Amino acid sequence: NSDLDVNTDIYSKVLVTAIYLALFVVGTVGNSVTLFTLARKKSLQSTVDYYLGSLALSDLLILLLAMPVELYNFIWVHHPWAFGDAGCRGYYFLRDACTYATALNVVSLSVELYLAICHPFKAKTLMSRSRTKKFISAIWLASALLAIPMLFTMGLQNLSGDGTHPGGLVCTPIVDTATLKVVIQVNTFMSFLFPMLVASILNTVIANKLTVMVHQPGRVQALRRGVLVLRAVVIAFVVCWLPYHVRRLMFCYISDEQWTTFLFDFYHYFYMLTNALVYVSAAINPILYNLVSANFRQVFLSTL
Amino acid sequence: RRPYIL
Numbered sequence: 001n002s003d004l005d006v007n008t009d010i011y012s013k014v015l016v017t018a019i020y021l022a023l024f025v026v027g028t029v030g031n032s033v034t035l036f037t038l039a040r041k042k043s044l045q046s047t048v049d050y051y052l053g054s055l056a057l058s059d060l061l062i063l064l065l066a067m068p069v070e071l072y073n074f075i076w077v078h079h080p081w082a083f084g085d086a087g088c089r090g091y092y093f094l095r096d097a098c099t100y101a102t103a104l105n106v107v108s109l110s111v112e113l114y115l116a117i118c119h120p121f122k123a124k125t126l127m128s129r130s131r132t133k134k135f136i137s138a139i140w141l142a143s144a145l146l147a148i149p150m151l152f153t154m155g156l157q158n159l160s161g162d163g164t165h166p167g168g169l170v171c172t173p174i175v176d177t178a179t180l181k182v183v184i185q186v187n188t189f190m191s192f193l194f195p196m197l198v199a200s201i202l203n204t205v206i207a208n209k210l211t212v213m214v215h216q217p218g219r220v221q222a223l224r225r226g227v228l229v230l231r232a233v234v235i236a237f238v239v240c241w242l243p244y245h246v247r248r249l250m251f252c253y254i255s256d257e258q259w260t261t262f263l264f265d266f267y268h269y270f271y272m273l274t275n276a277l278v279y280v281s282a283a284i285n286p287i288l289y290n291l292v293s294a295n296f297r298q299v300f301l302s303t304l
Numbered sequence: 305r306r307p308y309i310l
Contacts, residue, residue: 003305074309092310159308172308251310259306267307 001160001168004079006268007261013075016272020071023279027063029304030286031056037299044116044123045222047132051109052289054136058098058105059282066095067279073171075272080169085156088171092150096187099241100143103195106237108139109230110202117209117223146190149183173252180252188245196241199234206230225292232288240281244274 034056038049069091073081081088115123127135153175160168173180210227214220247270254263290297 004308006309078309154310157308170308173310248310251307256306264305264307268309271309 001079001165003161004159004168004170006078007265008268008272012269012272016075016276017071019276020067020075020279023276023283024063024067026287027059027279027283030283030300031059031063033300033303034286034289035060036303037296043126044112046129047126048109048112048226050129050132050136051105051112052285054105054139055102055285058101059285061094062098062282063279066091066098070275074275078170079159080167081156081171083171088156089151089154091171092154093147095147096150096191097140097143097147099187099191100146101140102237103191103199104139104143105136106230106233107195107199107202108135110199110206110234113223113226113230114202114206114209116226117206117213120219149186153180153183177252184248184252188249192241192245196234196238200238203227203231203234229288229292233285236284236288237281240277240284243270244278247271247274 035053038053038056041049069083069087073083083091153173154171155174156169157172157174158164158168159170159172175183206227210223213223247267250267250270286300290300
């Protein structure tokens with residue numbers, strides 16, 4: 001069956017694979033070393049160490065689980081799917097879950113930073129470490145809950161001619177067009193638009209209030225660092241995840257009569273692009289930490 | 305045809 005074949009040249013495949021492996025080593029090393037750094041730490045920074053830690057985790061997972069599977073079955077061999085039903089559902093579930101976790105962690109970091117720069121005297125009277133860990137757990141669980149629909153949206157289908165050819169066994173939405181549009185819309189709003197709009201607003205307010213504070217010790221230095229970092233994280237998240245959601249909307253909103261061979265090949269090269277950006281997002285955070293902070297850089301190099 | 309990979 002040559003109907004499930006994706007027409008992308010070997011050049012793009014090798015290139016994307018190379019970029020993928022680079023982001024793999026840089027990302028995994030960066031995030032793992034980040035975790036180990038936050039482990040041997042020793043006070044709101046100690047809380048943002050949890051958040052950061054969480055983020056690292058949310059990256060590592062995607063780098064250690066999502067990347068190999070996606071490389072193989074989504075870049076190198078589009079059919080048949082080789083990880084079964086549980087792999088099919090679990091993949092997308094993990095994807096969405098980690099996305100939600102990352103976004104919520106970003107917004108939470110925005111709020112915590114705001115409280116850090118506006119009411120530091122009320123902030124030192126701190127939400128305890130235990131309550132912070134509880135909040136991280138709450139974020140993760142909420143992310144899983146919001147990722148639930150992927151367990152029922154995706155599955156295995158035999159898209160071969162007779163529907164009996166083992167090579168036609170692919171991982172795909174096992175749901176009609178309209179409902180798919182619905183869950184994709186929900187994910188686009190809740191994992192991207194809404195929390196990043198909130199985070200961007202909060203970061204603008206953070207910038208302004210930082211300016212006001214400057215106009216009013218090492219607390220100012222660390223605060224400014226946190227501001228620039230968080231800004232960079234929000235911007236990077238938006239930029240990296242923007243084309244991704246556009247593609248998934250493109251997947252279900254284009255009618256059958258409009259789908260040409262051009263739009264097909266383009267869809268898959270665009271898949272390469274958007275997902276490459278996704279892994280860029282998966283590898284960006286530890287790089288930013290090393291640039292802005294001399295300390296974290298020294299400890300990062302202490303491990304390595 | 306239509307893509308099957310989301």
